[PDB]
Write a protein that binds this ligand. Structure first.
Ligand SMILES: CC(C)Oc1cccc(-c2cccc(-n3ncc(C(=O)O)c3C(F)(F)F)n2)c1
Ligand SMILES: [Cl-]
Length: 289
């Protein structure tokens, strides 16, 4: 069986929680805390290992943007540090291609990054690649057909509807069709041949809307909206279903977890996180042992 892992997040301050949800039975496990609290991080999995990337420790005793990469092994229930990134990246996006981790955008204080770097687990090494055409924090990232997409975000001045694609063999970014909605701090993932962008902040409101980009038609189509408006949500795919976790609706740090069934085009309440939080990192791997 495989679990949905949520790492870190924010409520009152940045959080160190690592908790795993089992869609088969509805259960939550609390697992080993992150060594350093962090919100605005991303999660990913490579070789059955869970990685937590970037973020920020918003704490009463100060605010520290994170360049950290840390690895969680479900077999041992232990976190280990990996090589740090070139730069702190709060409100980061990440994607995995061919066993490598791409770290995209994010902020360091008032620095809004367009830079991108790639981590190679085999060598515990980061290397910068071509920067994006746009500065993007709160950027959504997904991978389809070994191409990397950076979607929406905030450039330091404006929230963005724009999106762009990275072609690894050309080390080159190109713009794609923009979304039909401005979205910053959305959830972005892949399902089938489509990039989905769920929720976000448009500069005025948290969004419940959801749209998807078909790489073959180069067009975005709205699907059914989520049951909750949310920015700074976590998102993942577990057995062909999209799950969204937490976020902020303009009133409450949400504990709501919803899942999308593409065949019926419906969103369902699935479970509640143990506590409301925004800006988590989320990914899916094996059960501890
Ligand atoms: C929800 C907000 C009031 O408290 C937090 C706290 C910690 C992290 C986060 C977060 C996480 C991921 C992305 C974003 N980003 N990035 C840009 C933006 C924007 O405004 O453009 C946002 C937004 F969600 F906050 F919405 N934030 C939000
Ligand atoms: Cl923040």
């Amino acid at each position: 069986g495989r679990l949905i892992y949520t790492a870190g997040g924010y409520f009152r301050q940045s959080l160190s929680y690592l908790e795993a949800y089992n869609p088969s039975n509805g259960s939550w496990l609390r697992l080993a805390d992150l060594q350093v609290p962090r919100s605005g991080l991303a999660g990913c999995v490579v070789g059955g290992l869970l990685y937590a990337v970037g973020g920020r420790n918003n704490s009463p005793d100060g605010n520290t943007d994170s360049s950290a990469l840390d690895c969680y092994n479900p077999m041992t229930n232990q976190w280990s540090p990996c090589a740090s990134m070139s730069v702190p990246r709060n409100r980061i996006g990440v994607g995995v291609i061919d066993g490598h981790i791409y770290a995209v955008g994010g902020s360091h204080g008032c620095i809004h990054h367009s830079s991108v770097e790639r981590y190679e687990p085999e060598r515990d090494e980061w290397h910068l690649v071509a920067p994006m055409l746009t500065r993007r924090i709160g950027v959504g990232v997904a991978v389809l057909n070994r191409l990397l997409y950076a979607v929406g975000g905030f450039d330091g001045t404006n929230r963005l509807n724009s999106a762009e694609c990275y072609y690894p063999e050309r080390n080159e970014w190109r713009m794609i069709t923009p979304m039909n909605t401005i979205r910053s701090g959305a959830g972005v993932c892949v399902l089938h041949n489509c990039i989905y962008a769920a929720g976000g902040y448009d500069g005025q409101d948290q969004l419940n809307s959801v749209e998807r980009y078909d790489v073959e038609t180069e067009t975005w189509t709205f699907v059914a909206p989520m049951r909750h408006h949310r920015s700074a949500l976590g998102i993942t795919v577990h057995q062909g279903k999209i799950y969204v976790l937490g976020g902020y609706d303009g009133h409450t740090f949400l504990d709501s977890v919803e899942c999308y069934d593409p065949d019926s085009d419906t969103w369902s309440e699935v479970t509640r996180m143990t506590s409301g939080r925004s800006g988590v990192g989320v990914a899916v791997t094996m059960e501890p042992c």
